[PDB]
């Protein structure tokens, strides 16, 4: 699905590619239980360089899209 | 089920990797949900020291395959 697609702008900010892709996962055709780990993966894999390291290294109990936001969150 | 698996004390890695990709490959996953699902269990469900140990792991390791060997070569 077209979620697949979205990566973070070099001039986009982690909060607003992060309501884009969760609302773009929302409104997709998977099934409610995929969208969690469908969306931490693509924050691992589609976000910033910076990004990337701050989430590489975040504690492994960390599961929710929500959980991950705050968590970078708090390291800007 | 795939959402309850979890590393056993005495499973080994590979073990616990073919049985969560077995699972996942069979549910009712779309193609497209499979690879992340699987790396948020090993992220997630393995033992305490391995899901250490990947916390670890260089950000370009991205495919359930990379993340597999990485912790074949470093537990």
Redesign the interface.
């Given at each position: 699905?077209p979620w697949?697609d979205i990566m973070q702008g070099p001039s986009e900010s982690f909060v607003d590619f992060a309501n884009r892709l969760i609302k773009a996962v929302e409104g997709s055709?998977?099934?409610p239980?995929?969208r969690?780990?469908?969306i931490?993966?693509?924050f691992?894999?589609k976000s910033q360089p910076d990004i990337?390291?701050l989430?590489?290294?975040?504690?492994?109990?960390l599961?929710t899209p929500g959980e991950i936001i705050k968590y970078v969150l708090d390291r800007q």
């Open positions: 699905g697949a055709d998977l099934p239980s995929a969690a780990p469908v931490i993966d693509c691992r894999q990337q390291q989430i590489r290294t975040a504690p492994s109990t599961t």
